[PDB]
């Protein structure tokens, strides 16, 4: 068993005619979107392959920042927050992602402080993108995942390039073994 | 950046008429015997998996150990070592494999002491095992791994299976990322 | 509530012309093989009586151990590891169970150190061989064990019996009650 | 070998127009009415299913406590007390209840005292309920038992639920096996 | 999140000719008899309220008490206690819930000692009785519940009030976020 | 009173076709297999010999160990394990000695951990083996016994010499005297 | 290894009109008057069998003692004595076993001091009585015993009992096992 | 619970034709030779009464002594000793209750040192004396005595009056209560 | 007087149809079977020569061990054990040296702990193997020896070679003198 | 001059129907079988190799291994040891091996306890395996090496492989030059 700590970007975001209305739940091993059908996005491709090699993993600490690709002119807000419940439906509403315990708005062109994750270390046994995907309740679900990281954003005139997202955590391992999943 | 500790099987041995000389690289993704045409052997599913979703690996520790599935009767014995360089030829002869820095003899049915890695603490870019066996160059190969771990067993009059073999680890990541291997 | 510390027997193992792959969950109430269809061996029948009376178990310590009923001549390795997760599938082939993050292969008639559990003090709620049979996903079977134990060994040429092999804990027992399980 | 503490229900009591003289042994195993022909009455199901585990059992403490059902109007009384000995005979008549080491008259809607068992800390190996039934000679019987736990009640004119009794406890076990009884 | 305190009324007791072999799940949102069909009983009003507001709950402590509304007249028991498991069945028989790590028979109209769970600090994500009456096997469960408080009286002759049984606890919340519920099948 | 300490053989174990499922009841005084019908085997002569002389003695430790006369050809394991208490059955089934508090599969020639009883100091009326085979329940049985000591091996194709088993042990005897034993 | 201390019969004297000339010797094992023809006299039931049982035995302390079932009406001493060594004679005579570097005349009938061995601490290879008889030399009998422990009284003119010996000791063993006798 | 300590006196020795070879097991409670077929003798009638009441007793300390009737004329040896096991057999042969791990010979009148019972401080269920004679097996009786205590003497031409044997003890109870005894086959 | 110290060969052990039941003593100059008739077996050539100088020796430590020349194939046990006394008689039956104060069934092929002589530390006058082959009486014999050192195993289906047996020792003389043995 | 530490491969030993008595020295530049005629037999590869660059090596440590290739049915036993001395002959006889000062009988598959040199911190001039071969008396042949390394196996119905034999080492050396060896 071995600790971890490492930046890596989450996603990129782009503006759209849409509202946009994103969750990225916080597995083991991510890369997400798995399917099929497809569910969920982003994908830390470091922190999956490393612990596709381990068996048992605590994260001591995570967070989530912004950043930013455009010019002054953009007009649009960023809501991003952290839901620790899956019974709870995704709120449907950037206005209603404007309510949360932690939640921020930086956008769209600012510095902006990085939300953090509560405290919380407790053992969660590794699973795969298409494992996760595969379960059906979430009382299933809450067995392997702190909760879903929620981030929305609202409807934008045309589709642009805005900006990554940036995942920054540390980890901590226990127990190896590689072995086919079920 | 998480660490991780699992004890786990490695390969299952099988006596037979040929002489046994086996080596199983120990890099940060597993999972061979890679092809082609196909090299090594032996494979932790779990580690490639996990680690496939990081960026840099340290293992602080590492064990290889026996277990028999064999009745008393059987006659053999099975010596396993530890090379830390890649320049150097795999032994021919378990005679020769009998001579080692670190060696043991523990067939074929008794407890026997674990053979366990000499401490070296430095990071290792993880790489995948069709990668790994791409590699041309040994001086290309240490790049990437501790050195690899041989086993051998001597020659019997008839095929027959005889027991897991059993490697354990604690190892610890950093830096999350997940991206299509380079050809 | 109270304490208890035993050594008994798990199962006796058997060398056959096909591969052995077994696992043994370990439940608060074992006493495998639960059907049907049937499924996983061995039985400590103590346990599961003396567990039947509680409502809530800490096991604080447990070891697997080999015993050897064998001559000198047979031939024969037998691996010992221990998952503990149940998302992943149980490994095929004794080449496989040979990697694990702990692991032995002691056989055939050794001494040989005891595998031991990796420590793990959590509550862990009470429940019997027939309902843990009956439960369908892995999410759901993480509620009640620490792990699966996984035993392997290889063919042999002709049938015969080889050794018990040998658990030994201690456990610690909160809430009495004495009730029909749910269906 | 681990530790263990619970609070956990042991009977019904129930008015009747006989009178009622109980027991209850304390084995490492208990569930009584073992038959047969049944004998003994009360169930921690908890503590026979967890002791069926190990394989030898020392209780630190023990404890009897007594819980209203009934309404104020009701009339009578409840003796509860604890006989360390088998060779003596079970007492008849609630007057004869009346005298012990150790007593108590709780009845019938009150708070009350809790009786407690005077300690007693040495290895008992563990047997279950139709073993115990099974045993001949009292002098068999103290090998297992510290020693039976007596509840009586006086006849009342006609039946009715009146409240549980709660045994509640701190035990230790040593030596882990399952195997079946002889 | 904040903590909290309260004294409050479960349930209204009632003898009748049939036996009455009850329990309340004590979940982060009560508020029984959750359906459809109809399971469980009792309701804390001001618990699944004040907690439909948070997103995690931890119960420092709680009791269960009877209190008398009967003459001295009448005569039956009635017995308090406590699973901590779902996978075991709801015992038959009042002779049996008589037996438990934790019981009492205080009945009927008697001062008595409270009921008091055994200390279990964890958390404990929140969950709407609607919720938690759609789950299906006990392996669930176990996951938003301590476990089941089971009460128990014996058949009388004619049905008549008795008496409420009064739930008081602490307990402290942690993140804070009002949203729709799951739909669980 | 006197102190005393001895390594000595208990038992020279023989493979056979039929499954072997043996007991070894622990005694002050041993030497079974006392009759009749015969009942239990293994005999430290040294032990009931020199402790035919007192009255009251305590073992303050005890150990079983395992000796190999085999080749390494032989195949085959062996269970060594240690019931504390008499109300329960002897196991059937190597499988089922397989598991236990303290346990062990050694097999077949191989080093191997020494098993070793769980403290008990506590005072032990001596009586001799026909004495001890004469009683009739487990209840009487435990006033004597500490427990009896179980061993297991698995059946094989031909009947074989294997090796010895062998206790060790210190003890403390109390109060002298010596008369005839009651009927 | 275990240590061991009990206090025990030796003996039951019998006055008889012969003189009574009697040595006990203290082996490991003792149990005489073993045979063939019969030798010594004297048995400490607890002992041989105690120490039957072990290898190597260290005796760190022995005492003999006198107890009395007579009337005051009675005459008669009773004289008790140590040798270390065999290769001296039995002695003739009690007037001659007054004589001796320890020594008491208690008799008949009193409280009386303890003889009392003179300390030893060395290992002794335990034996069985039987073997022990079956020795020849005086030589080879020092390899086993400390020396023999001697006891006498005159004659009197009726056969009558009189009472008891009690010997006392510590004693700790070394090495288990359990074998056939050479 | 209370603490107690006496002098008493145990038995009235008889010089015999026949030898005598005598054995009072150390019940809690003791007045034999119960019956039937009546066995073993002596009666300390003090400690029964007094032990009757209780549940449960430790004897800290006891002792076995000897007084002399006798005129010096007489001859005869008196041996006492004590076995701790009842699955030995009683010593038959004065010759051989002489040697014990401990014993006496005080004969037949002479002051003499006091027989005294090693230390054995463990609880011990007190029983009567009827109980203890309808006991069948040795491994039963270990359960209620510490072991039987031996005396024996030789015979001589005439029977006499000789002195009486004299038990002292200090012992602990614990536990009261007061009913009556189960009736062992 | 000068102190050494040695690791050396003892005997090759051979499986055969009959019961082997073996004992060595240990005496200050070795080098059995002396006879005639010919007694006991195994010999330290280098101890002999070296104490043959001397004429006062105290071991302060001695060890014998176990080394496998065995195939996995084979099956079978040894007990090993160390009897302090020659009044005993030699145990017959391997299932009776399994019981000993001291014991071990390494066999057939595994590690094995090492059997140790407990401590003894007392003047032993030297003398040769045709000298102690000549002595009678037991009592004789204690004169000059700690105590006879066991080894046994069982019978096997036929002949065959399977490995040395291995003693250590720390040893210190006094009093140098070369003469002639009395007869 | 540089310090250095590894764990080697030996040799791979073979059961064979005649018996096995073999001798490996412990030279600064191993690598036998040198003739001719050729005598003793492991080699070492690396350490000859990187010990022919410099001049004086002194080695801290030393330990020699066995590993199971075999099944548990076989039967044999395999002595390990290590004389000091060159003056003494090789013993005749496993029997005769059994007795050494440091030794060992894991055999045949069993974990097993690793032999290990005493300590001896003293200078050695290195030289190569021809040169060794080479040498006459034996007087010669103690200024090069510590001791040859013995290890020995009974015979067995047919030959067969059984595992490799395993040396382990940290050396220190000193003194930097290359030059052609003297003849």
Same mark, same amino acid.
């Given at each position: 068993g071995t600790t971890c700590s490492?930046?890596?970007?989450?996603?990129?975001?782009?503006?759209?005619?849409?509202?946009?209305?994103?969750?990225?739940?916080?597995?083991?091993?991510?890369?997400?979107?798995?399917?099929?059908?497809?569910?969920?996005?982003?994908?830390?491709? $470091?922190?999956?392959?490393?612990?596709?090699? $381990?068996?048992t993993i605590v994260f001591n600490?995570?967070?989530?920042? $912004?950043?930013?690709?455009?010019?002054?002119?953009?007009?649009?807000?960023?809501?991003?927050?952290?839901?620790?419940?899956?019974?709870?439906?995704?709120?449907?509403?950037?206005?209603?992602?404007?309510?949360?315990?932690?939640?921020?708005?930086?956008?769209?062109?600012?510095?902006?402080?990085?939300?953090?994750?509560?405290?919380?270390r407790?053992?969660?046994?590794?699973?795969?993108?298409?494992?996760?995907?595969?379960?059906?309740?979430?009382?299933?679900?809450?067995?392997?995942?702190?909760?879903?990281?929620?981030?929305?954003?609202?409807?934008?005139?045309?589709?642009?390039?805005?900006?990554?997202?940036?995942?920054?955590?540390s980890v901590s391992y226990r127990?190896?073994?590689?072995?086919?999943?079920?």
């Open positions: 490492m930046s890596e970007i989450l996603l990129a975001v782009s503006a759209t005619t849409a509202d946009q209305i994103l969750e990225i739940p916080v597995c083991a091993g991510i890369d997400f979107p798995a399917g099929t059908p497809p569910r969920y996005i982003g994908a830390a491709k $470091w922190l999956a392959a490393q612990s596709q090699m $381990w068996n600490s995570v967070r989530i920042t $912004w950043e930013t690709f455009t010019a002054d002119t953009t007009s649009g807000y960023i809501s991003m927050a952290f839901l620790s419940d899956y019974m709870l439906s995704l709120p449907t509403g950037v206005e209603d992602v404007a309510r949360i315990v932690p939640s921020a708005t930086i956008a769209l062109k600012n510095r902006g402080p990085s939300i953090v994750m509560p405290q919380n407790t053992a969660f046994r590794c699973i795969q993108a298409g494992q996760f995907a595969a379960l059906g309740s979430a009382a299933d679900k809450q067995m392997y995942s702190p909760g879903r990281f929620i981030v929305a954003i609202p409807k934008a005139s045309a589709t642009q390039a805005v900006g990554q997202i940036k995942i920054s955590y127990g190896a073994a590689i072995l086919q999943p079920a």
